[PDB]
Design an enzyme around this catalytic site. Structure first.
Site, mmCIF file in Angstrom:
data_model
loop_
_atom_site.group_PDB
_atom_site.id
_atom_site.type_symbol
_atom_site.label_atom_id
_atom_site.label_comp_id
_atom_site.label_asym_id
_atom_site.label_seq_id
_atom_site.Cartn_x
_atom_site.Cartn_y
_atom_site.Cartn_z
ATOM 1 N N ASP A 145 0.838 -1.202 0.000
ATOM 2 C CA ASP A 145 0.000 0.000 0.000
ATOM 3 C C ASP A 145 0.869 1.246 0.000
ATOM 4 O O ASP A 145 0.726 2.123 0.846
ATOM 5 C CB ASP A 145 -0.978 0.021 1.185
ATOM 6 C CG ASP A 145 -2.013 1.136 1.067
ATOM 7 O OD1 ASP A 145 -2.337 1.544 -0.076
ATOM 8 O OD2 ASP A 145 -2.504 1.618 2.112
ATOM 9 N N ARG A 149 0.245 8.972 1.904
ATOM 10 C CA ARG A 149 -0.121 8.900 3.321
ATOM 11 C C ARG A 149 0.752 7.911 4.101
ATOM 12 O O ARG A 149 0.775 7.935 5.338
ATOM 13 C CB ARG A 149 -1.619 8.600 3.496
ATOM 14 C CG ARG A 149 -2.063 7.217 3.066
ATOM 15 C CD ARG A 149 -1.938 6.184 4.192
ATOM 16 N NE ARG A 149 -2.752 6.521 5.358
ATOM 17 C CZ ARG A 149 -2.563 6.016 6.575
ATOM 18 N NH1 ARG A 149 -1.572 5.159 6.796
ATOM 19 N NH2 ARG A 149 -3.358 6.375 7.573
ATOM 20 N N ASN A 150 1.452 7.038 3.386
ATOM 21 C CA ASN A 150 2.345 6.074 4.031
ATOM 22 C C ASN A 150 3.815 6.432 3.877
ATOM 23 O O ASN A 150 4.689 5.576 4.055
ATOM 24 C CB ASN A 150 2.069 4.650 3.536
ATOM 25 C CG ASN A 150 0.820 4.060 4.142
ATOM 26 O OD1 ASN A 150 0.509 4.303 5.308
ATOM 27 N ND2 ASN A 150 0.093 3.283 3.354
ATOM 28 N N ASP A 163 5.118 1.756 7.536
ATOM 29 C CA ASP A 163 4.154 0.654 7.471
ATOM 30 C C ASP A 163 4.421 -0.328 6.326
ATOM 31 O O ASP A 163 3.491 -0.872 5.718
ATOM 32 C CB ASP A 163 2.711 1.180 7.418
ATOM 33 C CG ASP A 163 2.283 1.864 8.708
ATOM 34 O OD1 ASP A 163 2.963 1.702 9.737
ATOM 35 O OD2 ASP A 163 1.248 2.562 8.685
#
Length: 283
Positions: A145, A149-150, A163
């Site tokens: 993913d 945002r990561n 993450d």
């Protein structure tokens, strides 16, 4: 849980503070994270359970992944763990400026013609993410993913992929899922992942292309106005996003290469690092 002296950190050297998101991650002060400076304060992020036994195994899983992946400038690194006589804590680096999506959106434009963000800095953000992904790939880590945002941003504007070690429930994704901040994570998925449940490093390259588009729209949401049902049909037709405004063809070029239908026809992360380096050095 067994004691690993390489990573164990005394929990009484942590002072828990503001939660950063929901397991859950909490900002904390740590004393003596560097054992050479035992009374020195540092700011860290503590991952912990909110929880079921499955929730516990997943966190232990992430902990063990992070131990093995080793250190790199452009990832969120493991600092220590607390496994003994208390709740499981996984202590990692804290990025002071938050995630890349919010960093970009907050910085949209005698210097009235100048916003905080310049082209070379946007390219540097992309380059740094590619360098981090190249490292993760070399350690046989597929993110699954990868998205703005990561990616987290340090006080010195260093990009750190976050993450990457998650046990993601890939066989039970709600494709229609919208997050509380309105994100549709399906929009970052390579077609082979979405349609065929196949993930490789080349599927992360697809996602990197989406991330590139996020960077050059200063935190725009991908496939503007397109709900999930329409996204499925559009992807089956080979739909690709348009060239964003104020984006040079070199970069839209890279985006489109990342979204080639055949995974083998997308660039590798090594190639992306090299391509972005050339743009960076071109000034």
């Amino acid at each position: 849980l067994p004691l690993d002296p390489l990573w164990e950190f005394p929990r009484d050297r942590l002072v828990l503070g503001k939660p950063l998101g929901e397991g859950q991650v909490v900002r904390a002060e740590a004393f003596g994270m560097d054992p050479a400076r035992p009374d020195q304060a540092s700011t860290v992020a503590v991952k912990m359970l909110k929880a079921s036994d499955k929730d516990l195994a997943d966190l232990v899983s992430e902990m063990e992944v992070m131990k093995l992946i080793g250190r790199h400038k452009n990832i969120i690194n493991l600092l220590g763990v607390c496994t003994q006589e208390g709740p499981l804590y996984v202590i990692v680096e804290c990025a002071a400026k938050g995630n890349l999506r919010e960093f970009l959106r907050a910085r949209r434009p005698p210097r009235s013609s100048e916003g905080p963000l310049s082209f070379p800095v946007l390219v540097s953000c992309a380059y740094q993410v590619a360098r981090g992904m190249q490292y993760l790939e070399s350690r046989k880590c597929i993110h699954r993913d990868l998205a703005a945002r990561n990616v987290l941003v340090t006080e010195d504007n260093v990009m750190k992929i976050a993450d990457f070690g998650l046990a993601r429930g890939v066989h039970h994704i709600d494709y229609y899922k919208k997050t509380s901040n309105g994100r549709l994570p399906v929009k970052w998925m390579a077609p082979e992942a979405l349609f065929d449940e196949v993930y490789t490093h080349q599927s992360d390259v697809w996602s990197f292309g989406i991330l590139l588009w996020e960077i050059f729209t200063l935190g725009g949401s991908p496939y503007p106005g397109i709900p999930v049902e329409e996204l499925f049909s559009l992807l089956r037709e080979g739909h690709r996003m348009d060239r964003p405004p104020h984006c040079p063809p070199e970069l839209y070029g890279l985006m489109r290469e990342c979204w080639h239908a055949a995974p083998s026809q997308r660039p590798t992360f090594k190639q992306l690092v090299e391509a972005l380096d050339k743009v960076l050095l071109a000034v």
